[PDB]
């Protein structure tokens, strides 16, 4: 297919129960559209510059979703609705570049 990936920035008020359930929602709905995690990494509560919804920090995600092209644009609607997910965007991936050796 292609070499997709996704950035999701989450609510930093997420400690022991809502964290587990709103990771399993992401995981299982990912599989419901049909997608294969390989490089899950999520990187904690970290800082931000300008006040995204009055908070100078937020939680972060990364996956390496293998998605068929048919529903990449319309799998966003499990994320349009839940306000407690802050930022959602999905990009392709490559790296043929290393300069000034």
């Amino acid at each position: 297919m292609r070499r997709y990936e996704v950035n999701i920035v989450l609510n930093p008020n997420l400690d022991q129960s809502q964290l587990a359930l709103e990771k399993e929602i992401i995981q299982r709905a990912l599989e419901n559209y049909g997608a294969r995690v390989e490089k899950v990494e999520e990187l904690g509560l970290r800082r931000l510059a300008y006040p995204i919804a009055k908070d100078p920090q937020g939680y972060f995600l990364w996956y390496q979703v293998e998605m068929p092209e048919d529903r990449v644009n319309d799998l966003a609607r499990e994320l349009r609705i839940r306000d407690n997910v802050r930022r959602v965007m999905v990009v392709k991936s490559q790296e043929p570049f290393l300069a000034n050796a």
Binding site: L48, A49, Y50, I52, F97, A99, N100, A101
Partner: protein, 73 residues
Amino acid sequence: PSRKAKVKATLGEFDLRDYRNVEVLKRFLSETGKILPRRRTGLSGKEQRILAKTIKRARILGLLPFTEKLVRK
């Protein structure tokens, strides 16, 4: 184009397409947020266009203010 710092040869092996390492591209919005012209670095066109492109990508998801202030004026 005078050279007072010449940030091109100062840092070694880097990456332009990456937008996770803010420690490299914190210097490339230098003070106000304005992406810098080529007289500062010396990078050629096919690197400088994607250097602008990665700042415009990473400028959405936090990590870069792109609007704010300088106080010595």
